[PDB]
Amino acid sequence: MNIFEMLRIDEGLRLKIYKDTEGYYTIGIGHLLTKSPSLNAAKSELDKAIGRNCNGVITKDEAEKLFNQDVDAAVRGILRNAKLKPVYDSLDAVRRCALINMVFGMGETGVAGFTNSLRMLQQKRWDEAAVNLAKSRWYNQTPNRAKRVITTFRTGTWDAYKNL
Numbered sequence: 001m002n003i004f005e006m007l008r009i010d011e012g013l014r015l016k017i018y019k020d021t022e023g024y025y026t027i028g029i030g031h032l033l034t035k036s037p038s039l040n041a042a043k044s045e046l047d048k049a050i051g052r053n054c055n056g057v058i059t060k061d062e063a064e065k066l067f068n069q070d071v072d073a074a075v076r077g078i079l080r081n082a083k084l085k086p087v088y089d090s091l092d093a094v095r096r097c098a099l100i101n102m103v104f105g106m107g108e109t110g111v112a113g114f115t116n117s118l119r120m121l122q123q124k125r126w127d128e129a130a131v132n133l134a135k136s137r138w139y140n141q142t143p144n145r146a147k148r149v150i151t152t153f154r155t156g157t158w159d160a161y162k163n164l
Helices: 003-011 039-050 060-080 085-090 093-112 115-122 126-133 137-141 143-155
Strands: 014-019 025-028 031-034
Touching: 003 060, 003 093, 003 143, 014 039, 025 039, 025 060, 031 039, 031 060, 060 085, 060 093, 085 093, 085 115, 093 115, 093 143, 115 126, 126 143, 137 143
Parallel strands: none
Antiparallel strands: 014 025, 025 031
């Protein structure tokens, strides 16, 4: 289990423009196109992103390409972020995957906002951090994926995905 298989499991794979849990227009593996209702705004974003006329339909290769870029951007964002970096550096490899997961789905800005949780993880206070993390809109909105991420944080194993 690596970060790519973990996220494929959590975001799923779709070849056509779709709406995410939050109403937003998405494609492939969790790739947010636009937080705006125009499906026509989304097809545009899409074409811009693939560099061709697609409609709302892309190939698997296209989605993986998107995926590779997104994971890369997530890691680089973490390493550039003053809040994120020290937590990342302090952690073991599995748990570092759990933070990439969060960042990829909620953005750099969102995760950095989890101040107290970040401080607990940095302090290696696993059970506490897991309890604090569950106290969010994020967990309440998508409980099964949030619980999977949170268990990864709590334990340091890929148990939640072993499922799977």
